[PDB]
């Protein structure tokens, strides 16, 4: 019902699932760096994916850390964005699935997972507040409405 609490309850739900949203400006840049590493089909351990991202993000966003970026990667993992190759005694490697090798499609699956988390947590958030929470503006409402429509069958 009440908006300012919907927001703190959303981000606590996200964090309860081992995930993080870093804020609209920082999330967008973090997601572009994941794409920069993985859009060509490269296959990176979780460790090296995090290192690539943190090292390129931290200069513009000095609070970036391996912990916080690991949480962002977990969100994409929960969203089923990666093909994971398991290697027994060796670290698993992660690639972006082909479908998610462009920013708009990756960011859509990311946002959709956050809406799914809100639904799991019993939080009823309208497209305008979604646009505010994920983009910091009122220009992504039709995008958010499309995600909601698709999650109600």
mmCIF file of N, CA and C in Angstrom, residues 58-121:
data_model
loop_
_atom_site.group_PDB
_atom_site.id
_atom_site.type_symbol
_atom_site.label_atom_id
_atom_site.label_comp_id
_atom_site.label_asym_id
_atom_site.label_seq_id
_atom_site.Cartn_x
_atom_site.Cartn_y
_atom_site.Cartn_z
ATOM 1 N N UNK A 58 34.645 0.814 -10.241
ATOM 2 C CA UNK A 58 35.174 1.548 -9.091
ATOM 3 C C UNK A 58 35.716 2.946 -9.444
ATOM 4 N N UNK A 59 36.414 3.116 -10.592
ATOM 5 C CA UNK A 59 36.905 4.504 -10.869
ATOM 6 C C UNK A 59 35.781 5.572 -10.939
ATOM 7 N N UNK A 60 34.637 5.205 -11.518
ATOM 8 C CA UNK A 60 33.479 6.163 -11.566
ATOM 9 C C UNK A 60 32.529 6.106 -10.354
ATOM 10 N N UNK A 61 32.486 4.968 -9.697
ATOM 11 C CA UNK A 61 31.632 4.643 -8.542
ATOM 12 C C UNK A 61 32.534 4.027 -7.438
ATOM 13 N N UNK A 62 33.219 4.874 -6.662
ATOM 14 C CA UNK A 62 34.250 4.346 -5.748
ATOM 15 C C UNK A 62 33.786 3.412 -4.644
ATOM 16 N N UNK A 63 32.502 3.331 -4.357
ATOM 17 C CA UNK A 63 32.023 2.314 -3.425
ATOM 18 C C UNK A 63 31.883 0.880 -3.998
ATOM 19 N N UNK A 64 32.126 0.669 -5.284
ATOM 20 C CA UNK A 64 32.046 -0.658 -5.863
ATOM 21 C C UNK A 64 32.951 -1.590 -5.115
ATOM 22 N N UNK A 65 32.480 -2.789 -4.811
ATOM 23 C CA UNK A 65 33.320 -3.773 -4.153
ATOM 24 C C UNK A 65 33.061 -5.142 -4.741
ATOM 25 N N UNK A 66 33.912 -6.114 -4.372
ATOM 26 C CA UNK A 66 33.677 -7.439 -4.862
ATOM 27 C C UNK A 66 32.412 -8.004 -4.241
ATOM 28 N N UNK A 67 32.152 -7.668 -2.964
ATOM 29 C CA UNK A 67 30.885 -8.136 -2.329
ATOM 30 C C UNK A 67 29.624 -7.635 -3.071
ATOM 31 N N UNK A 68 29.537 -6.338 -3.321
ATOM 32 C CA UNK A 68 28.360 -5.729 -3.940
ATOM 33 C C UNK A 68 28.178 -6.201 -5.399
ATOM 34 N N UNK A 69 29.282 -6.384 -6.103
ATOM 35 C CA UNK A 69 29.188 -6.786 -7.490
ATOM 36 C C UNK A 69 28.872 -8.283 -7.570
ATOM 37 N N UNK A 70 29.361 -9.038 -6.627
ATOM 38 C CA UNK A 70 28.924 -10.453 -6.519
ATOM 39 C C UNK A 70 27.403 -10.554 -6.356
ATOM 40 N N UNK A 71 26.814 -9.649 -5.562
ATOM 41 C CA UNK A 71 25.358 -9.587 -5.377
ATOM 42 C C UNK A 71 24.613 -9.246 -6.689
ATOM 43 N N UNK A 72 25.184 -8.353 -7.519
ATOM 44 C CA UNK A 72 24.612 -8.065 -8.797
ATOM 45 C C UNK A 72 24.656 -9.251 -9.723
ATOM 46 N N UNK A 73 25.791 -9.907 -9.799
ATOM 47 C CA UNK A 73 25.906 -11.140 -10.576
ATOM 48 C C UNK A 73 24.916 -12.234 -10.105
ATOM 49 N N UNK A 74 24.737 -12.371 -8.766
ATOM 50 C CA UNK A 74 23.759 -13.326 -8.252
ATOM 51 C C UNK A 74 22.343 -13.029 -8.766
ATOM 52 N N UNK A 75 22.001 -11.749 -8.870
ATOM 53 C CA UNK A 75 20.694 -11.336 -9.373
ATOM 54 C C UNK A 75 20.503 -11.830 -10.827
ATOM 55 N N UNK A 76 21.525 -11.647 -11.682
ATOM 56 C CA UNK A 76 21.499 -12.132 -13.058
ATOM 57 C C UNK A 76 21.466 -13.654 -13.085
ATOM 58 N N UNK A 77 22.147 -14.291 -12.115
ATOM 59 C CA UNK A 77 22.114 -15.769 -12.023
ATOM 60 C C UNK A 77 20.694 -16.225 -11.663
ATOM 61 N N UNK A 78 20.059 -15.574 -10.696
ATOM 62 C CA UNK A 78 18.736 -15.933 -10.265
ATOM 63 C C UNK A 78 17.763 -15.728 -11.434
ATOM 64 N N UNK A 79 17.967 -14.664 -12.203
ATOM 65 C CA UNK A 79 17.199 -14.426 -13.426
ATOM 66 C C UNK A 79 17.423 -15.399 -14.579
ATOM 67 N N UNK A 80 18.280 -16.408 -14.400
ATOM 68 C CA UNK A 80 18.604 -17.375 -15.465
ATOM 69 C C UNK A 80 19.220 -16.747 -16.710
ATOM 70 N N UNK A 81 20.091 -15.749 -16.509
ATOM 71 C CA UNK A 81 20.740 -15.079 -17.631
ATOM 72 C C UNK A 81 21.997 -15.819 -18.119
ATOM 73 N N UNK A 82 22.540 -16.728 -17.324
ATOM 74 C CA UNK A 82 23.831 -17.317 -17.667
ATOM 75 C C UNK A 82 23.693 -18.746 -18.074
ATOM 76 N N UNK A 83 24.581 -19.186 -18.961
ATOM 77 C CA UNK A 83 24.853 -20.623 -19.166
ATOM 78 C C UNK A 83 26.115 -20.907 -18.361
ATOM 79 N N UNK A 84 26.033 -21.894 -17.469
ATOM 80 C CA UNK A 84 27.102 -22.160 -16.540
ATOM 81 C C UNK A 84 27.722 -23.478 -17.009
ATOM 82 N N UNK A 85 29.016 -23.458 -17.201
ATOM 83 C CA UNK A 85 29.695 -24.715 -17.440
ATOM 84 C C UNK A 85 30.416 -25.217 -16.170
ATOM 85 N N UNK A 86 29.995 -26.349 -15.622
ATOM 86 C CA UNK A 86 30.628 -26.960 -14.434
ATOM 87 C C UNK A 86 31.868 -27.760 -14.792
ATOM 88 N N UNK A 87 32.898 -27.687 -13.935
ATOM 89 C CA UNK A 87 34.157 -28.315 -14.299
ATOM 90 C C UNK A 87 34.795 -29.107 -13.176
ATOM 91 N N UNK A 88 33.989 -29.819 -12.416
ATOM 92 C CA UNK A 88 34.499 -30.782 -11.398
ATOM 93 C C UNK A 88 35.385 -30.123 -10.358
ATOM 94 N N UNK A 89 36.654 -30.441 -10.327
ATOM 95 C CA UNK A 89 37.508 -29.777 -9.358
ATOM 96 C C UNK A 89 37.776 -28.269 -9.695
ATOM 97 N N UNK A 90 37.558 -27.833 -10.940
ATOM 98 C CA UNK A 90 37.888 -26.494 -11.361
ATOM 99 C C UNK A 90 36.665 -25.589 -11.178
ATOM 100 N N UNK A 91 36.930 -24.295 -11.172
ATOM 101 C CA UNK A 91 35.823 -23.318 -11.046
ATOM 102 C C UNK A 91 34.846 -23.435 -12.221
ATOM 103 N N UNK A 92 33.551 -23.258 -11.989
ATOM 104 C CA UNK A 92 32.541 -23.144 -13.053
ATOM 105 C C UNK A 92 32.732 -21.867 -13.860
ATOM 106 N N UNK A 93 32.416 -21.923 -15.144
ATOM 107 C CA UNK A 93 32.537 -20.771 -15.997
ATOM 108 C C UNK A 93 31.131 -20.307 -16.344
ATOM 109 N N UNK A 94 30.980 -19.007 -16.476
ATOM 110 C CA UNK A 94 29.732 -18.368 -16.792
ATOM 111 C C UNK A 94 29.801 -17.635 -18.138
ATOM 112 N N UNK A 95 28.836 -17.897 -19.034
ATOM 113 C CA UNK A 95 28.628 -17.081 -20.216
ATOM 114 C C UNK A 95 27.217 -16.482 -20.152
ATOM 115 N N UNK A 96 27.005 -15.336 -20.772
ATOM 116 C CA UNK A 96 25.630 -14.873 -21.014
ATOM 117 C C UNK A 96 24.954 -15.776 -22.038
ATOM 118 N N UNK A 97 23.702 -16.178 -21.792
ATOM 119 C CA UNK A 97 22.961 -16.869 -22.838
ATOM 120 C C UNK A 97 22.873 -15.895 -24.044
ATOM 121 N N UNK A 98 22.888 -16.465 -25.260
ATOM 122 C CA UNK A 98 22.769 -15.664 -26.503
ATOM 123 C C UNK A 98 21.648 -14.586 -26.505
ATOM 124 N N UNK A 99 20.505 -14.966 -25.963
ATOM 125 C CA UNK A 99 19.307 -14.100 -25.921
ATOM 126 C C UNK A 99 19.577 -12.831 -25.130
ATOM 127 N N UNK A 100 20.576 -12.877 -24.211
ATOM 128 C CA UNK A 100 20.820 -11.787 -23.314
ATOM 129 C C UNK A 100 22.121 -11.006 -23.581
ATOM 130 N N UNK A 101 22.640 -11.118 -24.794
ATOM 131 C CA UNK A 101 23.889 -10.482 -25.210
ATOM 132 C C UNK A 101 23.746 -9.080 -25.802
ATOM 133 N N UNK A 102 22.598 -8.448 -25.527
ATOM 134 C CA UNK A 102 22.374 -6.990 -25.792
ATOM 135 C C UNK A 102 21.855 -6.382 -24.516
ATOM 136 N N UNK A 103 22.177 -5.115 -24.303
ATOM 137 C CA UNK A 103 21.790 -4.459 -23.086
ATOM 138 C C UNK A 103 20.274 -4.437 -22.844
ATOM 139 N N UNK A 104 19.474 -4.104 -23.854
ATOM 140 C CA UNK A 104 18.037 -3.901 -23.538
ATOM 141 C C UNK A 104 17.475 -5.275 -23.076
ATOM 142 N N UNK A 105 17.908 -6.348 -23.742
ATOM 143 C CA UNK A 105 17.366 -7.671 -23.353
ATOM 144 C C UNK A 105 17.869 -8.180 -21.957
ATOM 145 N N UNK A 106 19.121 -7.894 -21.640
ATOM 146 C CA UNK A 106 19.692 -8.220 -20.345
ATOM 147 C C UNK A 106 18.974 -7.403 -19.242
ATOM 148 N N UNK A 107 18.824 -6.121 -19.495
ATOM 149 C CA UNK A 107 18.243 -5.242 -18.478
ATOM 150 C C UNK A 107 16.778 -5.612 -18.261
ATOM 151 N N UNK A 108 16.063 -6.012 -19.318
ATOM 152 C CA UNK A 108 14.697 -6.527 -19.190
ATOM 153 C C UNK A 108 14.589 -7.757 -18.300
ATOM 154 N N UNK A 109 15.484 -8.720 -18.484
ATOM 155 C CA UNK A 109 15.422 -9.921 -17.663
ATOM 156 C C UNK A 109 15.780 -9.583 -16.190
ATOM 157 N N UNK A 110 16.779 -8.693 -15.987
ATOM 158 C CA UNK A 110 17.122 -8.177 -14.669
ATOM 159 C C UNK A 110 15.916 -7.545 -13.935
ATOM 160 N N UNK A 111 15.253 -6.636 -14.632
ATOM 161 C CA UNK A 111 14.115 -5.920 -14.047
ATOM 162 C C UNK A 111 12.968 -6.893 -13.741
ATOM 163 N N UNK A 112 12.738 -7.805 -14.672
ATOM 164 C CA UNK A 112 11.700 -8.796 -14.521
ATOM 165 C C UNK A 112 11.930 -9.675 -13.264
ATOM 166 N N UNK A 113 13.171 -10.027 -12.985
ATOM 167 C CA UNK A 113 13.489 -10.781 -11.785
ATOM 168 C C UNK A 113 13.217 -9.993 -10.487
ATOM 169 N N UNK A 114 13.507 -8.702 -10.464
ATOM 170 C CA UNK A 114 13.196 -7.844 -9.364
ATOM 171 C C UNK A 114 11.659 -7.742 -9.166
ATOM 172 N N UNK A 115 10.876 -7.589 -10.238
ATOM 173 C CA UNK A 115 9.411 -7.688 -10.138
ATOM 174 C C UNK A 115 8.970 -9.031 -9.597
ATOM 175 N N UNK A 116 9.597 -10.121 -10.023
ATOM 176 C CA UNK A 116 9.245 -11.438 -9.477
ATOM 177 C C UNK A 116 9.515 -11.519 -8.003
ATOM 178 N N UNK A 117 10.597 -10.882 -7.576
ATOM 179 C CA UNK A 117 10.957 -10.864 -6.134
ATOM 180 C C UNK A 117 9.908 -10.092 -5.320
ATOM 181 N N UNK A 118 9.492 -8.955 -5.855
ATOM 182 C CA UNK A 118 8.416 -8.158 -5.238
ATOM 183 C C UNK A 118 7.125 -8.998 -5.078
ATOM 184 N N UNK A 119 6.760 -9.726 -6.141
ATOM 185 C CA UNK A 119 5.606 -10.610 -6.073
ATOM 186 C C UNK A 119 5.746 -11.710 -5.005
ATOM 187 N N UNK A 120 6.915 -12.353 -4.895
ATOM 188 C CA UNK A 120 7.191 -13.374 -3.910
ATOM 189 C C UNK A 120 7.033 -12.791 -2.520
ATOM 190 N N UNK A 121 7.463 -11.556 -2.367
ATOM 191 C CA UNK A 121 7.440 -10.884 -1.107
ATOM 192 C C UNK A 121 6.120 -10.197 -0.798
#
